[PDB]
Amino acid sequence: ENALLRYLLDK
Amino acid sequence: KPEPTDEEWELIKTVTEAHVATNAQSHKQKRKFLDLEAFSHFTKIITPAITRVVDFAKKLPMFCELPCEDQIILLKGCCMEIMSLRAAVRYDPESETLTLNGEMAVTRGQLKNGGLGVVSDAIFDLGMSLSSFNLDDTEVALLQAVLLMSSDRPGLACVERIEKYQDSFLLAFEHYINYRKHHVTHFWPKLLMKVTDLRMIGACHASFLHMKPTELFPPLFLEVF
Ligand SMILES: COc1nc(C(=O)NCC(=O)O)c(O)c2ccc(Oc3ccc(Oc4ccccc4)cc3)cc12
User: Fold this and answer.
1) Residues in Cβ contact with B204 at an 8 Å cutoff, skipping those fewer than 6 apart
2) B58 and chain A: CB distance < 8 Å anywhere?
3) Which residues on chain B are in Cβ contact (under 8 Å) with A8?
4) Could you give the count of Cα atoms lying within 13 Å of B97 in the half-sphere of its Cβ?
5) Domain count, chain B
6) Residue B202 sits in which domain range?
7) Ligand 1 proximity of B97 Cβ (cutoff 6 Å)
8) Mutating residue 101 to S: effect (chain B)?
9) What are phi and psi of B58, to 5 degrees?
10) Fewer CB in 10 Å around end: N or C, chain A?
11) Is residue B24 lining ligand 1, measured as CB closer than 6 Å?
């Protein structure tokens, strides 16, 4: 899902 | 021997500053010198290292201009590569250690026992070969950018834009190596081999997929594999 990675990437 | 154009010095400033901003502790001074019961204790300390790689990539405008679905593919692709490079350039011939995170000095055996297997000897041999290369923060940062901007990664949308960014970093990098005049021979051809060396380490990403249970692993470690 890369859910935490999106979070990290999209501030 | 062509040397960096003014526009490359700006790209060099940008990439060097984003690297040093996101690289854990001169501050050897903070060093430690320390079975899933050793995998667990290693994977626990990867989460800060993954974040620093994301932070570096975010402090690079060209990457912030890509769609987040490309940003994710690119980060899963280069994390281990960049962490491995950042550890190998902190190799102490005297203690024969790499320094992980801020400063946890690990041995070839300890890192093998942390579940890296043959990738430990790989990074250790890399670190040992990189001693005579005397790579400054600029040279390490431009390697990270060449690795990061890889279009050979599956599922990418902006393959053409990414190859452009990489060709920029690659040329600015070569011109800096020209300006720098290292006492090693065939220095530029020798770095393209260490990029392959680094890329092969991150191609053994299933050698996790085989050595998977899953909730015993930090979430960010599971998101990049
Ligand atoms: C060099 O790798 C690491 N670097 C650092 C760090 O701070 N580098 C220095 C810096 O960036 O300044 C760490 O903190 C690590 C923590 C845990 C760790 O465990 C791991 C254990 C097994 C494992 O399986 C594979 C997955 C894919 C490919 C190959 C093996 C991956 C990882 C590895 C770490």
Assistant:
1) B118, B119
2) yes
3) 51, 54
4) 14
5) 1
6) 1-225
7) no
8) No effect on thyroid hormone binding
9) -70, -30
10) C
11) yes
